Write a protein that binds this DNA or RNA. Structure first.
Ligand SMILES: [Zn+2]
Ligand SMILES: [Zn+2]
Lengths: 50, 138, 116, 65, 76, 115, 46, 58, 99, 103
RNA sequence: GCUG
């Protein structure tokens, strides 16, 4: 959260509320959600050798 | 992370589309610091500028709203938020042009948006002038 | 701010929106020579009924589509409205019924909301 | 000034990784390999640790204490 | 009758502007306005129905003049 | 060809949808169907065009501006040939006869041939 | 209404009354900073 | 800055505003978006009459 | 639906026969419409650190909370004080001292 | 007041109707458009966001014949709910099965 | 002095 040096103090109270990601990104529950279609490589001609 | 593409038509002439989630996480978050300074001088006549304390409301034992953030020395206090038409230094000056008679000359925060006070600097020059500088944060 | 011809000042119908900037359709960038790179523009609110009518009838954008000089149109399409239209009207483009409808349905907003 | 708590684009928490990354660099670990050990696979997350400049330590030298 | 039959753009702007000021000052409205709260919108509706009580006096440069009714002039 | 508001042939360029000059569909509508009809079309295109581009995608990358093999060979040949010809012209002015173009000094002529 | 100010170099709290020169005991510094407000301040995390 | 040019030929006017401009293609070509902060300041004097009395009350 | 891999904090699964529009909705809902608990208001007393209070408030909001969202309820507009059902309170007090 | 139905004309022809859905975005509209465009009766279905600022989607359904257009829209919402119910059950069963094999 |  922070870095302090001698004689420095942080005192605070935090209130946590339910929210959706649309209002703010802080409420989003997933680091990333993504979908990829499955690859289907097809060799049209047989490939042999080097 | 820039994607070079044409998106939404709001980017026709140099305009660029930003991401809301990136801005929320802190992309482009910036601080603006502004000054406010006041000088209290000792005149040729043996008279001086002074800072009066906060003017209390007698009916409610709290300062009037225009004086809400003043500390007991009449100078605004670090940490508190200033709003428009609020005084920072409750300065009064002699209208000498038999006892002194003072006109109020308060330093006031003009600004469309609210600012926070980070520190108040008090120092004095050799001529017995008192210098006050406020650092303000947005 | 710099006005070289009469089309640099025109009258528009206001619509109130939350964000701080002034906003207009980019087809009107060519008369104002505006480029959205931190450009600023001025606004004046005529305080009289007679000043509304002279602003609306004489200085309206729909009455000023052509420059007085050579009689050529200045309010017209610009970048990403010419490129999108070009790529749309090329011979290689074919759409099925689902994507035809979803491009056309974009126009159904405002006064076109009632048309079949 | 201080390591950002969450990656700007993806949103992964990258605040926890700063102390480990500095330690891995103190050892023989390469910058690419150190980022790999922390688990920052995507480029968006890697740049946050790689491009971060730690000014909090320098600024604190001038702090009141 | 030598002057152009068509109403000029300048003439339309002034006739609407005076009519709107008159309507905004509580003048009678001859168009049975339906849900209109703006004097300029009401004035434009009156011009379309050709019911505006104003006569345009066109002054020739010599000093002679010809008066054309707003209804008589063609509106483009 | 735009016959009865149907586009029968041709793509739409700057010269047909843009601000440059006449033959612009908007101008034709203006005079033929009045100012209001012309304005409506401009508004409609502005809505339609971004949606197609945004969902088809247009991008520019170092690949687009990267010189292909054909140009890379051609340039070498063209540059070498051009440099050699210029040297010869330079040789003539230095030591000999360069046909002086009408109305010009020899140095002026060399500049023109070289350019 | 007691007022305590902290000096720039010594960092020692000094009580200065009105019309008193801004010098700090334990040092010669003439720059003094007022202490932070005791009042609670609310910040929206957004 | 003289009276002829500074104060007569060209002069400062009220009911005026200035801001940065940015694009919006979803507006019609005859429209301009005005922010609420300018709209609350820039007022127009509407004369009260039979057509607008119940509108201006609200 | 086939679960290719599941480990704490990561799930990989394959949906076969679903359409892109339905699938995109699930991704969009997960990113924006699934509720969670996060710090909204920070009350600050005695913050003497170099970090600015506004920056410190933003950092605290970003930090994730392990509380289960389904148990709690949405706070009504205003209603700052809150209730046991609608809010969680966390107190951070740290003072730095020489060893 | 989430759904306001605006008929195309003063005549209130039922076949063409625009449904304005409040507090909505592409997530409901795109999914609903696919479900209601798989109906043979709907000739044209499209959604448009009036402005990025306002969270409302205008969905226009034009039916092939005399269908009121409420009937195609309602059927599409019902189909989307059934597709969601099936996916949730299939996903939960698959997740439980995977954990059991891991154990 | 710089932005427009
Ligand atoms: Zn990342
Ligand atoms: Zn000291």
């Amino acid at each position: 959260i922070a870095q302090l040096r001698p004689g420095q103090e942080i005192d605070l109270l935090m209130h946590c509320v339910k929210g959706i990601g649309k209002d703010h990104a802080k409420f989003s529950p997933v680091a990333t959600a993504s979908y990829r279609l499955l690859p289907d490589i097809t060799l049209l001609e047989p490939v042999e050798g080097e | 992370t820039v994607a070079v593409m044409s998106y939404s038509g709001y980017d026709i002439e140099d305009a660029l589309v930003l991401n809301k989630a990136s801005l929320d996480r802190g992309f482009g978050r910036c601080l603006v610091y502004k000054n406010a300074k006041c000088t209290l001088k000792r005149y040729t006549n043996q008279t001086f500028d002074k800072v009066m304390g906060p003017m209390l409301d007698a009916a409610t034992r709290k300062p009037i709203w225009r004086h809400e953030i003043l500390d007991a020395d009449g100078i605004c206090s670090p940490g508190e938020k200033v709003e428009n038409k609020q005084v920072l230094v409750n300065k009064s000056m002699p209208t000498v042009t038999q006892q002194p008679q003072y006109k109020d000359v308060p330093i006031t925060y003009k600004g469309a948006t609210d600012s926070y006070i980070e520190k108040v600097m008090i120092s004095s020059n050799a001529e017995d002038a008192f210098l006050i500088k406020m650092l303000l944060r947005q | 701010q710099p006005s070289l011809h009469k089309l640099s000042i025109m009258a528009h119908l206001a619509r109130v929106k939350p964000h701080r900037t002034f906003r207009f359709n980019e087809c009107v960038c060519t008369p104002y020579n505006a480029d959205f790179d931190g450009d600023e523009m001025n606004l004046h609110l005529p305080q009289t009924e007679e000043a509304k009518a002279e602003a609306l009838v004489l200085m309206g954008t729909k009455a000023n589509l052509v420059t007085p000089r050579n009689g050529e149109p200045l309010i017209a399409a610009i970048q990403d409205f010419l490129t999108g239209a070009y790529l749309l009207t090329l011979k290689d483009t074919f759409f099925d019924r689902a994507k035809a409808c979803q491009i056309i349905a974009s126009i159904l907003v405002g006064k076109d909301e009632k048309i079949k | 000034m201080i390591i950002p708590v969450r990656c700007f684009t993806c949103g992964k928490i990258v605040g926890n990784k700063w102390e480990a990354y500095l330690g891995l660099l103190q050892a023989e670990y390469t910058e690419g390999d150190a980022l790999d050990a922390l688990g920052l696979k995507r480029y968006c997350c890697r740049r946050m640790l790689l491009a971060h400049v730690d000014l909090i330590e320098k600024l604190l030298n001038y702090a009141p204490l | 009758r030598i002057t152009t039959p068509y109403m000029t753009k300048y003439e339309r702007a002034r006739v609407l502007g005076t009519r709107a000021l008159q309507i905004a000052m509580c003048a009678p409205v001859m168009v049975e306005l339906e849900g209109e709260t703006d004097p300029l919108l009401i004035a434009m509706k009156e011009l379309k129905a050709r019911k505006i009580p104003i006569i345009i006096r066109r002054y020739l440069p010599d000093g002679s003049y010809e008066d054309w009714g707003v209804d008589e002039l063609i509106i483009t | 060809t735009i016959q009865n508001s149907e586009l029968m042939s041709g793509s739409m360029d700057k010269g047909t949808l843009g601000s440059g000059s006449k033959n612009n569909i908007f101008y034709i509508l203006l005079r033929d169907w009045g100012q209001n009809e012309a304005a409506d079309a401009m508004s409609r295109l502005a809505r339609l065009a971004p949606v197609y581009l945004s969902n088809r995608g247009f991008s520019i990358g170092i690949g687009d501006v990267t010189p292909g093999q054909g140009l890379l060979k051609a340039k070498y040949e063209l540059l070498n040939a051009g440099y050699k010809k210029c040297d010869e012209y330079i040789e003539a002015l230095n030591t000999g006869k360069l046909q002086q173009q009408p109305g010009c000094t020899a140095e002026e002529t060399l500049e023109a041939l070289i350019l | 209404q007691p007022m305590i100010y902290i000096c720039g170099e010594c960092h020692t709290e000094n009580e200065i009354k009105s019309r008193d020169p801004i010098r700090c005991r334990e040092c010669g510094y003439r720059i003094m900073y007022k202490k932070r407000t005791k009042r609670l301040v609310v910040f929206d995390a957004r | 800055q003289g009276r002829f040019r500074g104060n007569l030929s060209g002069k400062r006017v009220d009911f005026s505003g200035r801001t940065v401009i940015s694009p919006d293609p979803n507006l019609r070509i005859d429209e301009v978006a005005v922010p609420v902060h300018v709209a609350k300041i820039l007022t127009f004097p509407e004369k009260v009459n039979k057509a607008n009395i119940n509108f201006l009350r609200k | 639906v086939d679960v290719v891999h599941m480990d704490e904090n990561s799930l990989e699964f394959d949906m076969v026969g679903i359409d892109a529009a339905i699938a995109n909705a699930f991704r969009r809902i997960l990113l924006a419409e699934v509720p969670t608990m996060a710090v909204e208001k920070v009350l600050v007393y005695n913050n003497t650190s170099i970090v600015q209070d506004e920056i410190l408030a933003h950092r605290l909001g970003l930090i994730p909370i392990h509380a289960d969202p389904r148990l709690f309820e949405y706070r009504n507009q205003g209603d700052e004080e809150g209730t046991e059902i609608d809010t969680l309170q966390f107190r951070l007090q740290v003072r730095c001292t020489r060893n | 007041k989430t759904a306001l139905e605006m008929v195309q004309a003063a005549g209130t022809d039922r076949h063409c109707v625009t449904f304005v859905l409040h507090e909505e975005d592409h997530t409901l509209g795109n999914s609903l458009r696919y479900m209601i465009m798989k109906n043979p009766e709907v000739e044209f279905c499209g959604y448009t966001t009036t402005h990025p600022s306002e969270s409302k989607i205008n969905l226009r359904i034009q039916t092939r014949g005399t269908l009121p257009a409420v009937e195609p829209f309602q059927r599409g919402l019902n189909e989307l709910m059934n597709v969601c119910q099936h996916v949730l059950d299939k996903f939960e069963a698959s997740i439980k099965d995977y954990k059991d094999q891991k154990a």
